[PDB]
Design an enzyme around this catalytic site. Structure first.
Site, short mmCIF file in Angstrom:
data_model
loop_
_atom_site.label_atom_id
_atom_site.label_comp_id
_atom_site.label_asym_id
_atom_site.label_seq_id
_atom_site.Cartn_x
_atom_site.Cartn_y
_atom_site.Cartn_z
N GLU A 35 -2.59 -1.17 14.34
CA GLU A 35 -2.62 -0.50 13.04
C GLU A 35 -3.86 -0.86 12.21
O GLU A 35 -4.56 0.03 11.72
CB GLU A 35 -1.37 -0.84 12.21
CG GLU A 35 -0.05 -0.19 12.66
CD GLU A 35 -0.05 1.35 12.61
OE1 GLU A 35 -0.90 1.93 11.90
OE2 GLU A 35 0.80 1.97 13.28
N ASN A 46 -5.52 10.18 4.53
CA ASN A 46 -5.14 11.34 5.33
C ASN A 46 -5.43 12.56 4.46
O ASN A 46 -4.68 12.88 3.56
CB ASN A 46 -3.65 11.28 5.66
CG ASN A 46 -3.28 9.99 6.37
OD1 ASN A 46 -3.76 9.71 7.47
ND2 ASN A 46 -2.46 9.16 5.71
N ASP A 49 -2.59 15.58 3.96
CA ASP A 49 -1.52 15.53 2.97
C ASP A 49 -1.82 14.65 1.76
O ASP A 49 -0.93 14.37 0.97
CB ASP A 49 -0.20 15.09 3.62
CG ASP A 49 -0.24 13.67 4.15
OD1 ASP A 49 -1.28 13.00 4.06
OD2 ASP A 49 0.80 13.22 4.69
N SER A 51 -2.19 11.48 1.47
CA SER A 51 -1.53 10.16 1.42
C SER A 51 -2.53 9.12 1.97
O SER A 51 -3.55 9.49 2.54
CB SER A 51 -0.26 10.14 2.29
OG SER A 51 -0.57 10.43 3.64
N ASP A 53 -2.73 5.23 4.16
CA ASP A 53 -2.04 4.17 4.90
C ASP A 53 -2.63 2.88 4.35
O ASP A 53 -3.85 2.74 4.32
CB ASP A 53 -2.35 4.28 6.38
CG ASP A 53 -1.87 5.58 6.99
OD1 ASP A 53 -0.72 5.95 6.72
OD2 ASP A 53 -2.66 6.23 7.71
N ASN A 60 2.44 4.02 4.87
CA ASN A 60 2.09 5.24 4.17
C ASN A 60 2.68 5.54 2.79
O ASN A 60 3.90 5.49 2.58
CB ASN A 60 2.28 6.43 5.12
CG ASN A 60 1.63 7.70 4.61
OD1 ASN A 60 2.26 8.49 3.93
ND2 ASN A 60 0.34 7.88 4.91
#
Length: 130
Positions: A35, A46, A49, A51, A53, A60
């Site tokens: 990750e 991202n 959308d 958002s 991480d 998220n």
């Protein structure tokens, strides 16, 4: 903070992650590795959308933490996404625990299914004394 492998293994263990809802430490290590590379400062925006991480587990904003800028999201961990960028991973661990309490468990992370599921993850905790 970018953790050394075994340093993280022990940190996660002290935070009660070993066997949390049946998840071994090696699995948590494999997840954090793929990750963020054990980097608590890791962030991934991202564009699709809007958002982001956050942190070592790349949690998220759409569902788990609040950053204000994600149009109408939710905050299941009830934390500012900021808390997921601290050197101290206690808040990220608490949120990671919250994520796995859901039906899927650690399968919530696509990277875990792809890079850790049914793999020999022993190498993540070998030599760490955990």
């Amino acid at each position: 903070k970018v953790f050394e492998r075994c340093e993280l293994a022990r940190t996660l263990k002290r935070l009660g992650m070993d066997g949390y809802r049946g998840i071994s430490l090696a699995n948590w290590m494999c997840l954090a590795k793929w990750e963020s590379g054990y980097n608590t400062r890791a962030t991934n925006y991202n564009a699709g959308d809007r958002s982001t991480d956050y942190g070592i587990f790349q949690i998220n904003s759409r569902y788990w933490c609040n950053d204000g800028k994600t149009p109408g999201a939710v905050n299941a961990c009830h934390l500012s996404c900021s808390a997921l960028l601290q050197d101290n991973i206690a808040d990220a661990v608490a949120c990671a625990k919250r994520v796995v309490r859901d039906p899927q468990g650690i399968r919530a992370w696509y990277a875990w299914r792809n890079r850790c599921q049914n793999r020999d993850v022993r190498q993540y905790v070998q030599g760490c004394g955990v």
